[PDB]
Amino acid sequence: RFVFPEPTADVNYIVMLTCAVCLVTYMVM
Amino acid sequence: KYLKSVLRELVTYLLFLIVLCILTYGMMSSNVYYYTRMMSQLFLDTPVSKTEKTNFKTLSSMEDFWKFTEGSLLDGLYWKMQNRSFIFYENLLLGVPRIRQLRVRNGSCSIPQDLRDEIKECYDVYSVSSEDRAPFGPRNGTAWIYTSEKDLNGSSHWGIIATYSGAGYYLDLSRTREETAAQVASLKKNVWLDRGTRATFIDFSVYNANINLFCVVRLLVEFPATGGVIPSWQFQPLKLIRYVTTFDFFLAACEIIFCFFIFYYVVEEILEIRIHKLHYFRSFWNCLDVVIVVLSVVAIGINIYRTSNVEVLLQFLEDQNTFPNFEHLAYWQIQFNNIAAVTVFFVWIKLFKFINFNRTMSQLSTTMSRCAKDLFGFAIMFFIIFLAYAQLAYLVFGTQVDDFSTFQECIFTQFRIILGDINFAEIEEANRVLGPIYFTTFVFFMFFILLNMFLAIINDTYSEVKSDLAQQKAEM
């Protein structure tokens, strides 16, 4: 059931922010 | 000895510098500014009609665009000679203009069921996933039928709002005003710019045989999904028949010499990698030669690419009744100009390596080198608070001020505040309570509390360095 949507040219900020925080909290740690 | 190594590297660099400066003088001529200035004044800075006073750069409605198209546009393109058209009796209009439209389809968006009764149709914002591809209106010609990007030889543009495609509904105007006016009137009659249009481009080019220099023109008005019109323009003076005069041969010889110098620098920099020390990148004087070499190689490659694909000119010259597609060369010209400018800047910066001829310059160089770490340590703490202020301004004022409309605009506005350029006459009405507080607190905490630490650090380091080198001499 793997699909290849690519339906938008926009960006979701929630995932980017969550990943950035989860990486900075690892670098400082 | 040691005098035969620091002097050879100087003479092999001064020749490089003079060759680069010769090329730089060769590129930027003084006959270019006035060409663009007159064209821009002719097309952007004239009223659409004798009654109205709205020129191109102040369009505010879709109906004003139709006044511009059959109006100050045709009034500038077609001139009667004192058949072909000479725009200023000097600049030849070669080919025919093209006008192209980008539109979306109804139902690309969803209106909520609660108010679905009053809203009939909606059109989404522009995106390639939601772009109309079906015939509309009277399906007779090529202005009402979608044509692919590959069938137009088009490319993206990166407008102000979005990044538009190269495919759409296009129509080629005529060689004479009496036919172009009829074509545009027919386009206006059967509505061609409805609510679904998202962009509209106009392209043409000129020659001006007096000085061998083309000039490509692109005019863009984009209608966002929230209403309004956003105009934009671009004039680029190309040059495609370069090998005409003796100075052109001299410049070609200079480019060949520059290529040889870059090859020499590549070999003489790779000689100091494996034959000698490796991973010697804590110098800043060998991390800058790699930048120069890389940028010069990129510039050479870009020039070869943009001069090895000139088939558009020959294709147009074979049949001179069609649209000359010069919009690709005008992009690589811009990229080449940017790369050459940056390379020249860095080559000029590299001169600091060779000014240590006496003590009064070595002292300043040491003072600059010893305070770099402290300045870098403080710059982080400065810029964190700077970015905090920028984001606060963006979130609070970033909807109604224009100057804080985007993050970059916030950064540049704060820099101009530091310069003391902009004043808070418009911030206050955006927010009565946080208008003056932001301005006064920003000035107080970034003009003479955190801005004076750089001065303190630099003064203290200079005094320390001078004292140390003076005490070093006090034992002879």
Ligand SMILES: *[C@@H]1O[C@H](CO)[C@@H](O)[C@H](O)[C@H]1NC(C)=O
């Ligand atoms: C577009 O589609 C909607 C239905 O989704 C319809 O109500 C509307 O009339 C259509 N627009 C035109 C111009 O026909």
Ligand SMILES: *[C@@H]1O[C@H](CO)[C@@H](O)[C@H](O)[C@H]1NC(C)=O
């Ligand atoms: C297409 O344009 C022609 C131009 O004469 C005219 O017949 C009409 O406006 C359009 N429709 C058809 C079917 O030709």
Ligand SMILES: *[C@@H]1O[C@H](CO)[C@@H](O)[C@H](O)[C@H]1NC(C)=O
């Ligand atoms: C695109 O380029 C080809 C030449 O490769 C040319 O024949 C064709 O007419 C061009 N497209 C248009 C719409 O003129």
